[PDB]
């Protein structure tokens, strides 16, 4: 079962980030390479206001 294995960070990409209330990440992974963007969009009946992206920093942040 997929949930039970959560194990490597040596790779240094950022983990899945936290969408804002009433929204979701358009683009699922476990690891994103540094400098990748993930796009936030909103749940039904709510629409995006503003900057729609998070960028993965070498930081890990």
């Amino acid at each position: 079962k997929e949930v039970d294995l959560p194990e490597i960070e040596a790779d240094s990409g950022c983990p899945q980030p936290v969408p804002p209330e009433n929204g979701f990440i358009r683009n699922e992974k476990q690891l994103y390479l540094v400098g990748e963007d993930v796009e936030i969009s909103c749940l039904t009946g709510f629409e995006t206001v503003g900057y729609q992206y998070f960028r993965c920093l070498p930081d890990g942040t």
């Binding site: 390479l33 540094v34 400098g35 960028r55 993965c56 920093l57 070498p58």
Partner: peptide
């Protein structure tokens, strides 16, 4: 070219 924030 790639910036200091690992971004192409």
């Amino acid at each position: 070219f790639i910036d200091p924030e690992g971004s192409e």
